[PDB]
Design a protein around this ligand. Structure first.
Ligand SMILES: CC(C)CN1CCc2c(ccc3[nH]ncc23)[C@H]1c1ccc(CCC(=O)O)cc1
Length: 237
């Protein structure tokens, strides 16, 4: 991972991309929103594990550290994917190709329109910056590695794990800058755009926190992936 060139980092990320999934409803039948969005999220999570395992550096970490990082990041990862899919659909959220929803559709669940609104604004910001696919994959990998890295332990192994994570992040920063130099931006423009992109990450965190509050308020054993389910899926033979 740490020996990859910028172009090889980019190719590895683009190749790791998960598929776009569909919602499971009978489209011949009349048009619950939360059950549909929960089922979609459950299925995406499996693919997210596969993706995370292909982000360079990720499998170099301990299984316990892989679990912690996904546990911290999984709703942010789903959200950044949604915002990206929704970028060329002003005023709508493309949860799936057969489930494109507007903000009024979110009113059907108390607390949800607020979240819908924040996600639509972030998609709006992406459109204003003209975010590129290569930039988006870098940013999603940055969420995975960064979100849980401040909440681990100071065993010697933990100290080595945090160092590695920060080295892999440094390589993604290099790759982002490379992408922007290749596009022909000036050095000033490169650093300004790097900052703009990373500051949107703060908002994506905020959104995930607000959503997790909603999910925990359902008080449901079939909602939010447990440590153990994540551990079971990541602990592959
Ligand atoms: C209140 C928010 C958390 C609503 N979010 C907004 C982002 C999102 C959802 C579903 C599929 C998605 N695809 N891309 C993004 C995305 C939706 C949601 C709904 C239920 C769960 C529950 C999951 C479980 O209980 O295990 C998770 C996420």
């Amino acid at each position: 991972a740490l020996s990859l060139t910028a172009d090889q980092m980019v190719s590895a990320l683009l190749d790791a991309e998960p598929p776009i999934l569909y919602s499971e409803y009978d489209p011949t039948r009349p048009f619950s929103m939360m059950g549909l969005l929960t089922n979609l999220a459950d299925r995406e999570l499996v693919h997210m594990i596969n993706w995370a395992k292909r982000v360079p550096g990720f499998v170099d970490l301990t299984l316990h550290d892989q679990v912690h990082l996904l546990e911290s990041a999984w709703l942010e990862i789903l959200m950044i994917g949604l915002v990206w899919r929704s970028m060329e659909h002003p005023g709508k959220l493309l949860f799936a190709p057969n489930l494109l929803l507007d903000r009024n559709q979110g009113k059907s669940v108390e607390g949800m329109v607020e979240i819908f609104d924040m996600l639509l604004a972030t998609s709006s910001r992406f459109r204003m910056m003209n975010l590129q696919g290569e930039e988006f994959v870098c940013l999603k990998s940055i969420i995975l590695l960064n979100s849980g890295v401040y909440t681990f332990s100071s065993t010697l192994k933990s100290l080595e794990e945090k160092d590695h994570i920060h080295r892999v992040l440094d390589k993604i920063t290099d790759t982002l800058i490379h992408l922007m130099a290749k596009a022909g931006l000036t050095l000033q423009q490169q650093h300004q755009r790097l900052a703009q992109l990373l500051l949107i990450l703060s908002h994506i965190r905020h959104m995930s926190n607000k959503g997790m509050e909603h999910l925990y308020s359902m008080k449901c054993k079939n909602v939010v992936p447990s440590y153990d389910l994540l551990l079971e899926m990541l602990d592959a033979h």
